Structures are given as C-alpha cells and as structure tokens.
Amino acid sequence: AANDNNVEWNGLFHDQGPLFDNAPEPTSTQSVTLKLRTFKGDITSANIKYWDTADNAFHWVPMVWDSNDPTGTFDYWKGTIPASPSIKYYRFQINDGTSTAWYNGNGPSSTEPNADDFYIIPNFKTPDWLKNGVMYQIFPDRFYNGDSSNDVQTGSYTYNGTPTEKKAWGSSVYADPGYDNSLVFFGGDLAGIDQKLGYIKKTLGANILYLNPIFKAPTNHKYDTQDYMAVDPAFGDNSTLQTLINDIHSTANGPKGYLILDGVFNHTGDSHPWFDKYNNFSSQGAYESQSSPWYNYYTFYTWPDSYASFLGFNSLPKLNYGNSGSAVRGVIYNNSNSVAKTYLNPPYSVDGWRLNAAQYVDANGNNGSDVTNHQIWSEFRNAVKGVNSNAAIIGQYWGNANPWTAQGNQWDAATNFDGFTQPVSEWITGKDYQNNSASISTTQFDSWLRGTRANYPTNVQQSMMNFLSNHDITRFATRSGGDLWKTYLALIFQMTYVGTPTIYYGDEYGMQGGADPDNRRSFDWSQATPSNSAVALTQKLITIRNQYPALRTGSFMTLITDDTNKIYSYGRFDNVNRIAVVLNNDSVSHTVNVPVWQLSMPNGSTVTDKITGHSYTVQNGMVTVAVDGHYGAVLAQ
Ligand SMILES: OC[C@H]1O[C@H](O[C@H]2[C@H](O)[C@@H](O)[C@@H](O[C@H]3[C@H](O)[C@@H](O)[C@@H](O[C@H]4[C@H](O)[C@@H](O)[C@@H](O[C@H]5[C@H](O)[C@@H](O)[C@@H](O[C@H]6[C@H](O)[C@@H](O)[C@@H](O)O[C@@H]6CO)O[C@@H]5CO)O[C@@H]4CO)O[C@@H]3CO)O[C@@H]2CO)[C@H](O)[C@@H](O)[C@@H]1O
Ligand SMILES: OC[C@H]1O[C@H](O[C@H]2[C@H](O)[C@@H](O)[C@@H](O[C@H]3[C@H](O)[C@@H](O)[C@@H](O[C@H]4[C@H](O)[C@@H](O)[C@@H](O[C@H]5[C@H](O)[C@@H](O)[C@@H](O)O[C@@H]5CO)O[C@@H]4CO)O[C@@H]3CO)O[C@@H]2CO)[C@H](O)[C@@H](O)[C@@H]1O
Ligand SMILES: OC[C@H]1O[C@@H](O[C@H]2[C@H](O)[C@@H](O)[C@H](O[C@H]3[C@H](O)[C@@H](O)[C@@H](O)O[C@@H]3CO)O[C@@H]2CO)[C@H](O)[C@@H](O)[C@@H]1O
Ligand SMILES: OC[C@H]1O[C@H](O[C@H]2[C@H](O)[C@@H](O)[C@@H](O[C@H]3[C@H](O)[C@@H](O)[C@H](O)O[C@@H]3CO)O[C@@H]2CO)[C@H](O)[C@@H](O)[C@@H]1O
Ligand SMILES: OC[C@H]1O[C@H](O)[C@H](O)[C@@H](O)[C@@H]1O
Numbered sequence: 001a002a003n004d005n006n007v008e009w010n011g012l013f014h015d016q017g018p019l020f021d022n023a024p025e026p027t028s029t030q031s032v033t034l035k036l037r038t039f040k041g042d043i044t045s046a047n048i049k050y051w052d053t054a055d056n057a058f059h060w061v062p063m064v065w066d067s068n069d070p071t072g073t074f075d076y077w078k079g080t081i082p083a084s085p086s087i088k089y090y091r092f093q094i095n096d097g098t099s100t101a102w103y104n105g106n107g108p109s110s111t112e113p114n115a116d117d118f119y120i121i122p123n124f125k126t127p128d129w130l131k132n133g134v135m136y137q138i139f140p141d142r143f144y145n146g147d148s149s150n151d152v153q154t155g156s157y158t159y160n161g162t163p164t165e166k167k168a169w170g171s172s173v174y175a176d177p178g179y180d181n182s183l184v185f186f187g188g189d190l191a192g193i194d195q196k197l198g199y200i201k202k203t204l205g206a207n208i209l210y211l212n213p214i215f216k217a218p219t220n221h222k223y224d225t226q227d228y229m230a231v232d233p234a235f236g237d238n239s240t241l242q243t244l245i246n247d248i249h250s251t252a253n254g255p256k257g258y259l260i261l262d263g264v265f266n267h268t269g270d271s272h273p274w275f276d277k278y279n280n281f282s283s284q285g286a287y288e289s290q291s292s293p294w295y296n297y298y299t300f301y302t303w304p305d306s307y308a309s310f311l312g313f314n315s316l317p318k319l320n321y322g323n324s325g326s327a328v329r330g331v332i333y334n335n336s337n338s339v340a341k342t343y344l345n346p347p348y349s350v351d352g353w354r355l356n357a358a359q360y361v362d363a364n365g366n367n368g369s370d371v372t373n374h375q376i377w378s379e380f381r382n383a384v385k386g387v388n389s390n391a392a393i394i395g396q397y398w399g400n401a402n403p404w405t406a407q408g409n410q411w412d413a414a415t416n417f418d419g420f421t422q423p424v425s426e427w428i429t430g431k432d433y434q435n436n437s438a439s440i441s442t443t444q445f446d447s448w449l450r451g452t453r454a455n456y457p458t459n460v461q462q463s464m465m466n467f468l469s470n471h472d473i474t475r476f477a478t479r480s481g482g483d484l485w486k487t488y489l490a491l492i493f494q495m496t497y498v499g500t501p502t503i504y505y506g507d508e509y510g511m512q513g514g515a516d517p518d519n520r521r522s523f524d525w526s527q528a529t530p531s532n533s534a535v536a537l538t539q540k541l542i543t544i545r546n547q548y549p550a551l552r553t554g555s556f557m558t559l560i561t562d563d564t565n566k567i568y569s570y571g572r573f574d575n576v577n578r579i580a581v582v583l584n585n586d587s588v589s590h591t592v593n594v595p596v597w598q599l600s601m602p603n604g605s606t607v608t609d610k611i612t613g614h615s616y617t618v619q620n621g622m623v624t625v626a627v628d629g630h631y632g633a634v635l636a637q
C-alpha cells in the first residue's frame with residue numbers, strides 16, 4: 001500500500017476485540033481507546049466520529065498513528081472516546097488523499113453509513129461465564145428417566161378431558177388415538193439429568209445447562225404453568241432441584257456449572273389457581289369469579305370465556321402486568337418471593353432465565369413490542385441483577401432483538417435464530433429451519449452473519465444463544481437429510497463462532513425430527529458415546545474452544561468467501577492467539593491456501609490444526625491445508 005489517493009478496504013479492520021478496544025464494557029468513568037488497522041502507509045488521516053446520546057450530536061476525534069503489527073504489513077491508528085455515563089455510537093472516516101472510506105459494524109463503505117455503528121454502552125455488562133461457556137439445552141421429559149417412581153402413566157390423570165399416555169422409551173412421540181400430543185410422557189426427570197451430568201460436563205464438556213419448563217403443569221412441555229413455586233411431580237420435587245443445582249455447581253464432577261431455567265412469564269396455564277378454568281383448587285380463580293383476588297391478573301374481553309392469551313391459545317391466558325408496582329409485576333419479579341427472585345436466591349441460586357414469549361409481555365392484554373413491554377424488561381433486569389449481577393437474562397425472539405438489547409437496560413442476549421440458526425441452516429442444508437427450501441452461498445452466508453452481528457453490542461454478540469436446532473423448529477439432522485458430515489461442519493462452525501455455542505440435546509449425535517412435537521424425541525442413549533463420530537467431534541471442539549479465549553471473545557475477521565469451491569474462512573484472534581478457521585461446504589475435498597498474514601501470523605511461525613494435530617509452517621504469509629467436503633480445520637497458534 002501507499003499514499004496513492006486510495007484507501008484499501010482489504011487492509012482496514014476494527015471490532016471490539018482485545019487488539020482494537022481497551023474497554024469493551026466500560027463504566028461511566030472509563031475512557032475508550034480504539035485502534036483502527038490499515039495497510040502500512042496506506043492513508044493520510046483517520047477520524048473517529050461518534051454520536052453522543054447525552055447531547056444528541058456528533059463529535060470528532062482525530063486519530064494518530066500508534067504502531068505497526070509484528071509482520072510489518074499493517075498500521076494501527078489510535079483515538080480515544082472520553083468517559084461518561086452516556087450511550088455512544090461510533091464509526092470511522094478514513095482518508096488517503098482524495099479517497100475517503102467509512103467503516104463501522106458493517107465494515108467498509110464508500111458512502112457514510114447511518115446505521116450499524118459500533119456501540120459504547122457505559123455500565124452495561126453481560127455475564128462473562130455466558131460469553132465463555134458452552135450450553136446444553138434439555139427438554140426434561142425426553143432426556144433421561146432417572147427415577148421411574150415419579151413417571152406419569154397412561155391414564156394417571158386427565159387434562160381438559162384427555163387422559164395422559166406413557167410411551168416406551170425410544171418410541172414415537174405422537175399420541176395414539178384417544179390421546180393428545182401434549183399429554184404424552186416418556187419419563188425424563190431431574191434425577192435423570194443429575195445422573196447424566198458426567199456425560200454433559202465431561203463426555204461433551206458443556207458447562208451451562210438450559211432446561212425447558214420444569215414447574216408444575218399438566219402438559220409434557222409445561223409452558224402452561226400451574227405453579228411456578230413447585231417443581232412438577234413428574235420431574236421430582238424442589239429438593240430434587242436443589243440437589244441437581246448443587247451437582248451442576250460442583251467442581252468435583254467436572255468444570256463449574258451454571259443452570260438457566262425457562263421463565264414463562266407472558267402467560268400462565270389455564271389450570272393455574274389464579275385462573276382455575278377447571279376448578280382444580282378450592283380457591284376462586286379469575287375464570288371462576290370476577291371477585292377472585294386474582295381477577296385483574298388477566299384480561300377478559302367477555303368474561304369468562306373470551307380473554308387475552310398467547311397466540312389465541314385459550315390454554316395460555318395472558319398476564320396483565322398493569323403499571324409499575326402492580327401485583328403481577330410483584331409476583332413475577334419485584335417481590336423477594338417472586339418467581340424470578342425465589343430461584344435466584346438460596347437455597348436455589350440458579351444462574352439465569354430464558355424469557356419465553358418475551359416480546360408479548362404487556363399490560364391490558366396488548367401484544368407487547370411497545371413502550372410498556374420494554375419498561376417491564378428494564379425493571380426485570382434491575383430486579384434480577386440486584387439479586388445476582390451475574391445471573392443471565394436471555395430473551396426468546398425470532399428476529400433482530402436489538403430493541404431488547406442495544407440500550408443495555410433489558411436482556412443480556414437472545415435466542416439467535418436470525419443471526420445463527422437460520423443462516424447456518426440455509427448455508428449447510430439448503431433449507432430454512434422449518435425445513436423449507438432456502439439456500440445461500442458462502443458470500444451470502446458471510447454477509448448475513450456480519451449484518452446480524454452488527455445488530456448487537458459486542459458483549460451481547462458474545463452472549464447470544466447459538467443453537468443448530470431447538471424445541472420449536474425441525475432438527476438439523478432432518479434438514480440435512482441425515483448426512484452426518486453436514487452436522488460435522490455445523491459443529492465446527494458453531495464451536496468457533498461469536499456467541500454461546502448451544503447444543504439442543506441429541507444434536508451432538510445427529511438426532512433427527514420434524515416439527516413440534518417430533519423435534520422432542522426421547523434421547524437415544526448408546527448413541528451418546530464417542531463411538532458416534534459427531535459426539536467425539538463435539539467433545540473435541542468444546543475442548544478447543546475452552547483452550548482459546550480468542551474463540552470466545554476475540555475479534556472476528558473474514559478471510560475467504562469462495563463461492564466456486566464453497567470455502568469459508570475466518571479468523572478469531574486476540575493479543576495472545578491467532579486462529580484461522582477453514583470450512584469446506586462442498587461435497588468434495590479442497591486444498592486451500594489460507595491468508596494467515598491477515599491475522600498477522602508471522603512467517604516461519606508454526607500453526608496447528610487443533611482438530612487433527614497436524615502442524616503447519618507459515619511461509620509467504622500463507623498456510624496450505626487440505627480439507628474434506630463438509631468439514632473444517634482450526635489452524636491455531
Ligand atoms: O513540515 C512538517 C512535517 O513535514 C513532513 O511531514 C509531512 C509529509 O511530508 C506528508 O507526506 C504528510 O505525511 C503523511 C504521510 O504521507 C502518510 O503516509 C501518513 O503518514 C503515516 C504513515 O502512513 C504511517 O505508516 C506511520 O508511519 C510510521 C511507520 O509506520 C513506521 O514504520 C516508522 O517508519 C519510519 C522509520 O521508523 C524510520 O526509520 C524511517 O524509515 O522512516 C519511516 C517512515 O517515516 O515511523 C513512521 C512515522 O511514525 O505514521 C505516519 C504519520 O506520522 O500521514 C502523514 C500525515 O498526513 O504530512 C506530513 C505533515 O506532518 C516531514 O516529514 C515532517 O518531519 C515534518 O515535521
Ligand atoms: O432497535 C431496532 C433498530 O436496530 C438497529 O438500529 C441501531 C443502529 O444500527 C445503530 O447504529 C444505532 O443507531 C444510532 C446511530 O448509530 C447514531 O448515529 C444516531 O443516528 C443518527 C444517524 O447516524 C444520522 O444519520 C441521522 O439519521 C438521519 C438519516 O441520516 C437520514 O437518512 C434520515 O433517516 O433521517 C435520520 C434522522 O436524522 O440522525 C440519527 C440520530 O438523529 O442514533 C442512532 C440511535 O437512535 O442504534 C440503533 C438502535 O439500537 C437497526 O439498524 C435498525 O434498522 C432497527 O430499527
Ligand atoms: O427474510 C429472508 C432474507 O433474510 C436475509 O437475512 C438477513 C439480512 O441479510 C440482514 O440484512 C438482516 O440484518 C439486519 C439488516 O442488515 C438491516 O438492514 C436491518 O433490517 O436489520 C436487520 C436485523 O436482522 O437480517 C436478515 C435475517 O432475517 C437474507 O440476506 C436474504 O437473502 C433473505 O431473503
Ligand atoms: O395442542 C395445542 C398446541 O400444542 C403445541 O404447541 C405448544 C408447544 O408444543 C409448547 O412448546 C408451547 O409453545 C411455547 C414454545 O415452546 C415457546 O418457545 C414459545 O416461546 O412460547 C410457546 C407458548 O408458551 O405451547 C404451545 C401451545 O400449547 C403444537 O405445536 C400446536 O400445534 C398445538 O396447537
Ligand atoms: O463430504 C466430505 C467427504 O465425503 C466423503 O467422505 C467423500 O468420499 C470425500 O471425498 C469427501 O471429502
């Protein structure tokens with residue numbers, strides 16, 4: 001490069017990783033020093049332009065040359081944004097004579113962008129254990145039956161006129177004639193999870209468990225809560241839960257663990273005493289009497305049969321959050337004995353909440369995604385963090401969750417359907433997560449990923465729940481048509497990307513399944529051993545991620561987007577390690593010359609494909625590696 005009236009985009013780079021930002025989660029008194037990379041001698045001047053919410057105006061900070069990288073290929077320019085309590089958004093103006101380029105969350109641009117700027121949110125912090133961990137999601141009734149004595153038998157009880165049905169482990173989840181899909185039970189329970197912690201924390205290595213609903217409810221999924229204060233009898237009792245938590249937190253059976261529970265706060269089930277549609281309690285519920293002490297917990301259009309609910313489901317009456325200080329806000333999160341605080345305090349001390357149907361939470365039966373909804377989650381955050389600042393808050397949302405994350409006053413992160421699940425699905429399987437035809441190329445995949453990461457503050461990106469499948473979509477293995485190699489590829493990407501890798505129970509061995517309820521099949525053990533190639537790889541990949549902080553909180557830089565050979569390569573790096581990931585999405589092998597010079601890997605230095613152990617030497621800024629179809633290499637040093 002040179003001063004030739006031309007800014008070379010290829011040399012430009014900035015994100016909030018260690019090498020470029022000295023304070024990614026600053027307080028009100030910490031200034032933020034940013035470094036912008038360019039090719040050596042490529043520019044004449046650079047400036048930081050930031051919008052300060054304190055005075056609704058743009059501010060200008062000229063940058064100064066700081067240093068060259070170790071390879072002498074790049075320049076690092078530096079500038080500092082002053083400390084204050086206000087949210088700020090910045091972008092860079094880069095000039096080389098008559099050539100000007102702009103750069104922000106979405107990368108380089110010839111024209112000045114007006115969105116996707118980088119975020120500075122003083123005092124906003126997401127749990128570091130979440131950014132650095134690996135999560136494992138379990139749908140309780142389908143994981144492991146550790147205690148047959150609490151099993152729901154066929155006919156054990158009836159819900160809304162339909163008796164329960166017990167299935168033999170491994171059999172179909174579909175209810176037989178006379179029964180209902182939501183009342184089919186296999187016997188999975190908390191004792192079972194506890195007895196299988198060795199598999200989770202050791203065989204695989206995940207240190208975070210996220211469970212679907214576990215509180216008393218008539219269905220097998222239990223999103224129709226009957227009692228938030230009691231573990232459902234089929235899963236055990238509150239004592240069973242305390243034991244599981246102790247064993248998860250224990251460091252004697254593996255790495256320290258964390259537990260995230262599913263918080264179903266938008267609505268309750270129609271069998272909850274506050275509503276009591278079928279008179280299952282001596283108390284008077286809202287459905288039973290307009291004089292009920294809980295009458296105003298719900299919204300009736302025509303008492304008692306027409307009321308606000310979750311997506312028209314009468315079995316899920318919607319809670320009326322009213323105004324600040326309401327009884328409903330009290331029982332859900334404000335009270336010390338609320339649902340949210342009870343489990344965050346001893347003798348439970350869980351580590352977080354996954355917020356079900358979070359976008360709908362509102363007052364008066366309204367549908368959320370409004371001022372009131374965000375006000376509620378802001379109060380929720382204060383209540384939760386007040387009890388445990390390191391308790392995680394992850395909201396369910398299918399699209400861009402910027403509205404609930406980008407001001408640092410609500411959630412720490414969200415279910416990454418839009419920034420992870422969907423793009424990964426369409427790139428690898430050629431199907432969207434609902435198993436409908438939808439395919440994207442490598443260049444499109446890369447662009448999609450960048451644009452979605454740019455929707456969030458950096459700490460939020462690093463805390464997103466990144467799963468290949470989950471209880472509301474089709475299994476990855478079904479979308480892949482049963483091709484296990486596609487799962488191999490997906491796992492390598494998942495374990496080396498930005499955000500919390502999240503494994504939906506069974507995905508690690510290639511479990512198949514269509515739409516709900518077929519995506520909740522019973523866990524086929526004996527398939528859960530290193531003898532299964534996907535399980536062995538999963539274990540290896542988790543060990544790799546845990547070895548390199550760069551894979552969890554390091555910068556992310558695109559290296560190769562080859563649509564001809566279907567090769568995707570990106571680097572994860574920080575002040576200590578530089579890692580070049582090389583993915584082959586083709587059905588045949590490809591030998592790739594990886595431009596590791598972009599990550600500043602010194603010539604003559606050694607790089608190791610942590611997956612195979614095969615060592616390589618960097619020469620002329622390159623490293624040549626052969627990669628099988630639907631597979632990948634993780635070249636680290
Ligand atoms: O009269 C005042 C002033 O006049 C002169 O400077 C002016 C200069 O003539 C004019 O071109 C312009 O300068 C531009 C420059 O053209 C741009 O390239 C840019 O300069 C920055 C450069 O791009 C960066 O790479 C960085 O340079 C670093 C290197 O990266 C380091 O490796 C190191 O290299 C030096 C090495 O250590 C020495 O042994 C020797 O080999 O020389 C090497 C090159 O100097 O250090 C340099 C310097 O830190 O940083 C550069 C910025 O300093 O942007 C410039 C500003 O737009 O404008 C100049 C006005 O000041 C005259 O040279 C000055 O002495 C005099 O004070
Ligand atoms: O919440 C959903 C929302 O999420 C995302 O929005 C976020 C942005 O991506 C992010 O950059 C940040 O936005 C800041 C912005 O960075 C900051 O500069 C300031 O915005 C300025 C514009 O930069 C400036 O150009 C001007 O905007 C003009 C615009 O140029 C003109 O074309 C026309 O549209 O009139 C606009 C109004 O003047 O002024 C604004 C401020 O007045 O402030 C922004 C925050 O308000 O944060 C966003 C929210 O988190 C997605 O990008 C977005 O699509 C989603 O709707
Ligand atoms: O709806 C199908 C559609 O999905 C697209 O995926 C990405 C977009 O590429 C990406 O732009 C977008 O991310 C943000 C966008 O850049 C902003 O302009 C603004 O709209 O906020 C968005 C927040 O997500 O996300 C979508 C994922 O839904 C595919 O690119 C496109 O090919 C496909 O048809
Ligand atoms: O038989 C009625 C319907 O049953 C099925 O829908 C169930 C889901 O199976 C159950 O998980 C739950 O959905 C929740 C979903 O899992 C959660 O991620 C989302 O955020 O909130 C949903 C509600 O809490 O409840 C529904 C409704 O009972 C089945 O899929 C559907 O077709 C049947 O009509
Ligand atoms: O899908 C990746 C691999 O699949 C099969 O093993 C092919 O024999 C091999 O050529 C290819 O690299």
Ligand SMILES: [Ca+2]
Binds near residue numbers: 001003005041042043
């Ligand atoms: Ca130039």
Ligand SMILES: [Ca+2]
Binds near residue numbers: 145146149150151189
């Ligand atoms: Ca059982």
Ligand SMILES: [Ca+2]
Binds near residue numbers: 284
């Ligand atoms: Ca009653």
